[PDB]
Structures are given as C-alpha cells and as structure tokens.
C-alpha cells in the first residue's frame, strides 16, 4: 500500500523535473530547434502532465478517498489524453523522420512553421478526443445497470473505467496500430539509409577500383569498359543532392568523356593520362561531397536509432500492462502483485525519456 505511494512519488518527481529540464535544454540550445525537437517538447509537456497527475491519483486511490464518479472518470480520462498524446507525438516524430529521409529537400519547404503548429494542434486534438471518449457516454453508466446510479464512490480503476474500451479501443486501435505503423516506418528508414550508405559506398568503390584498373592496363578494350563503369557511377552519384555539388560532377563526367574520346581512337596512353585528371576532380570535389553526405546519413541513422529506443521503451512499458488488461476482459484472474508492477512499468516510461536523451544526444548532457 505504501510501496506504491513512494514509488509513484519517485516516478512523478523524476518525470516532472527531468522533462522540464528537457524543455529548458531544448529552449536554451539554439541548434535543437527543429520540428522533431518541437514534437519532443510536446512529448515532454505530456510527460510533465503525467507526473503532475500521477502524484495525487496514486495515494487518492490507495487511501480510497471518496470522490465523485465523474471526477474519478475525469482523472483517469485525463491520464489517457496525456498517454495518447505521447503516442501521437511519437507518431509525429516518426512521420517527420520518414519524410526527412524520403524527401531530402521537398519536406523542408513543404512543412512550414505554421503547418508544424497546425500538425501539433491536430495531434493534441486527436489525443483529447480519443482519451475523453469514456467521458462521452462510454463509461460504466452506458451498459452496466449497477454502475449506472452509483455516486460518490471510492475511486478505483475497475469501478470507473470500461476495460472493454481499454482492450479494444485504447490498445488495438490507438496503441497497437500506431506502434505497428511506427515500427514499419523505422524499419523502412533503417532500410533506406543502409541502401543509401551502400550505393554511395558502391559508387565510391567503383570510382576507386576503376581508377586502379586504368593504371594497370595494356589495351583500350579494358579501358573503355572501365570508364563505362565510372560514367554510370558518376551519373548515379550526381543524383544524391547548393549548385557546387552537381557542378563538380559535370567536370568529372566531362573528363570521362574526354578520355572516352581518346580510348575510342586507340590511344591507350592518352586515355590513361586523361584519367589521371579525374583524381584532381576526385580530391577537390568527391572527397568533400561524399564525406559530407556519408556523415549526414550516419547522423540521420544515429538519430533514428536514438528515437527508436524511445519507441522500444514505450513498447516495453505499455504492452505488458495491455496483456494484463487483456486477461481482465477475457474473464481471467490477475494477481495483485503482478498488476501493481504493470502500472508502475506503465508510468516508468515517464522517467525513461530524459535519460535516453542524455545518453544518445550529446547536446543534452552538456546542458
């Protein structure tokens, strides 16, 4: 009885202090002021709210203080609007990330600042509507006859919250489907990036291997197909985008065409000498643009893997409780000790968010 009270005082305090710290770190640091970090602020605000109202609710229910039926329903539904706000904000982060990787330039111009405020308003609007649905006649007064006239009872989760709603509407439609979509999105990002890290490595490897095939060659037959592999590689690597990036590739393809003309005339030594002018373009441009592109995708992959750990720890926190609630609706018995850990773990997600930002993002521990 007092185990739960001080464990939720701990969870609550850590969540409030940590997430207001996260809000401060985002606000002070000017580099962490993108749309993704705006949704991180949204998640942090919802997390603060979860802590602010877990603190009274735990002891209130534990002491069995008789509040009004609708008041206890309000408390629980408020907890659900913040919880679903967290899920919807995570979905917003996932959609933002997917758009950023898929649409390198289009996403930025399309998503205006006002449009991001529109998206955030839509996000919390959806959360408000979904979470407050029990208060809109989906409560125990709807179908249960005994629970339709009860007033000023002890606030308990079984007494006020429709477990039918929890298993089917809350979990399957709103917890399960967005996490499935989000996980698919993250795996798609982890596939697109590793394909973009492979082909950029593959276009660089053929631009390095065929440079060495040319330097050990005897006839123009094995030189002509060597530049044919480069010219396919340099045309493919040109489509990886401001105008200085594609200007250096026009020199590189043009210098290949300068040495294809010499290789077509049978000049095996003028083509090799003109292929040595590719290395001047390779060190001046292709060293600079590929390593900037490789570090940008590696930063994008490490940012996505950091945000995926938020989803995994979300899925480690509410899927256990969901399975516990599943048994309840299917008329099975759940032990008290098993259940108590389940609710704590569901609220442990509030405390896990700030620490993950500190260990993964290097701009959070310094502030």
């Amino acid at each position, epitope marked *: 009885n007092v185990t739960y009270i001080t464990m939720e005082i701990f969870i609550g305090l850590c969540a409030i202090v940590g997430n207001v710290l996260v809000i401060c770190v985002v606000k002070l640091n000017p580099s962490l002021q993108t749309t993704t970090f705006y949704f991180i602020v949204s998640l942090a605000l919802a997390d603060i709210a979860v802590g602010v109202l877990v603190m009274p609710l735990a002891i209130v229910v534990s002491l069995g203080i008789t509040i009004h039926f609708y008041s206890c329903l309000f408390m629980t539904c408020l907890l659900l609007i913040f919880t679903h706000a967290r899920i919807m904000s995570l979905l917003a982060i996932a959609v933002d990330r997917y758009l950023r990787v898929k649409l390198t330039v289009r996403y930025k111009r399309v998503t205006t600042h006002r449009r991001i405020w529109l998206a955030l308003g839509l996000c919390w609007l959806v959360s408000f509507l979904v979470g407050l649905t029990p208060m809109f006649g989906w409560n125990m007064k709807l179908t249960s006859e005994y629970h339709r006239a009860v007033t000023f009872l002890s606030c308990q989760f079984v007494s006020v919250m429709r477990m039918d709603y929890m298993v089917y509407f809350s979990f399957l439609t709103w917890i399960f489907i967005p996490l499935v979509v989000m996980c698919a999105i993250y795996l798609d990002i982890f596939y697109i990036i590793r394909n973009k890290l492979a082909d950029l490595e593959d276009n660089w490897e053929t631009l390095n291997d065929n440079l060495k095939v040319i330097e050990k060659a005897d006839n123009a037959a094995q030189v*002509k*197909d060597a530049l*044919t*592999k480069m*010219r*396919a*590689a340099a*045309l*493919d690597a040109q*489509k990886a985008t401001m105008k200085d990036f594609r200007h250096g590739f*026009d020199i590189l*393809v*043009g210098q290949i*065409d300068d040495a*294809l*003309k010499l290789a*077509n005339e049978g000049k095996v030594k003028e083509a090799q000498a003109a292929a040595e002018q590719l290395k001047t373009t390779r060190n001046a441009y292709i060293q600079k643009y590929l390593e900037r592109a490789r570090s940008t995708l590696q930063r994008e992959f490490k940012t996505a893997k950091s945000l995926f750990l938020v989803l995994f720890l979300f899925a480690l926190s509410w899927l256990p409780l969901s399975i516990i609630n599943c048994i309840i609706y299917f008329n099975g018995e759940v032990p008290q000790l098993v259940l108590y850990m389940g609710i704590l773990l569901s609220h442990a997600n509030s405390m896990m968010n700030p620490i993950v930002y500190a260990y993964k993002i290097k701009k959070f521990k310094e502030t």
Partner: antibody
Amino acid sequence: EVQLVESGGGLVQPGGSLRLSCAASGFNVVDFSLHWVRQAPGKGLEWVAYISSSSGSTSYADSVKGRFTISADTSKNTAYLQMNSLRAEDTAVYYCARWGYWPGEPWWKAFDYWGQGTLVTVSS
Amino acid sequence: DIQMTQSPSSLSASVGDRVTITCRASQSVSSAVAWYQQKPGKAPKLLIYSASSLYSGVPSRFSGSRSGTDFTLTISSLQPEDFATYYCQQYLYYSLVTFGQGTKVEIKR
C-alpha cells in the same frame, strides 16, 4: 521549326558506294551531336555512326567500322554519311537523329528529334 | 557491349488496358535509358528520357520507372494511337548506344 531531312539514299550495287546528306534546318550542327541509326526491314533499330562537329569526334559501330565514314559541314548545316563497300545486310532505312552536349538537359534528351529517314537498297 | 534485353516481344492489349514493357540492362547505365515509339512507316518519337521524365508533347498516360538495372515503360490508359512498336535505348555514351529488340503492341480480340 527544328527538323532533319535526309537525302542521297537510293539503289546501289553490293560493293558500291553511297553518300547520305542530313540537312539540319532549325538548329546548328556545332551545338548538337548528330547520329545515324538504321532500321533493317522487319528488324529493330541499330546505331551506326556519330559526328560531333564542335570537336571533330567520330565513332562507328563495329559492323560499319572501317567502311562507313561520317563528316559534317558547319556552313551547309549538313552531316554526311559516306558509305563504302556496301553489302546485303546494309539494306535499311537510315535515320538521322540529333543529341545534345554534356552537360545539362540537352544531353539527357537523347534523339529527341529524328529525321524522316531514307531507304538504302543494296542488291545485285 | 551493353545489351538491352526487352522482356516483351509480343504484347496484345485493347483500348483502356494498362501495359508494362520491361527492359533489362546488361550492366549499370545509371538513369540514361530512353523510350521511343515507332509507328510503321514513320520515324521513332521520343516518349521518356532519363527513365522517368516525360518528353514535351507526349501524353501523360506514358510513364517510366527504374529499379536498378531494370527499366519499365507503363501506359495506364491505352488509346488507339498507342498501337506501335516500342524501343528502349541506353545512352550512357555517344558511342555506346544500343537499342532494344522492340515491343509490338497489337490489338487484342
């Protein structure tokens, strides 16, 4: 209007000679590379030759290498395909097509405008 | 040296059908793949260049796509004026031009 007109295609003996004239009208031959593509009757298209009159660069297919010579006149705005030692499988409809220079979108539009084609009949 | 193996050599379809012509390159030619339409007795006309970009004046029902070394021409809403022969050309260099074998599109009945 940009157009290509072929001429000089007719009836020749095997081992004979022929010259085809691809008269460009709406553009200049030093700005666009001119190519010859032939189509045998009942068969598909086959690339034959290539002239780049800005740089003088010529290239030929391996079936026509050493026997077909290409040239271009900047003043007459005309590319010439001179045929030597014609044989039976050179009987085709020869199309003249233009292709832009690197870099940009003129290069990516390969053979955007074609000539109407001329028929070369090699037969004894 | 670079082969463009066009997968369909005979293709029967009616008006309004969605057709797909697959051209496979022997090695990498990047995006430099063009598509042409040749009516009988006439010169070929460019439809798709760069393997996705529609040429000006071509109707919007033609479309292109690239999947590695695989290139695909698609006509979503086929018309009676679309019954011709369709060739795929790779154009990686001036001297390395090779055409496909041609896909005749004829009327199904």
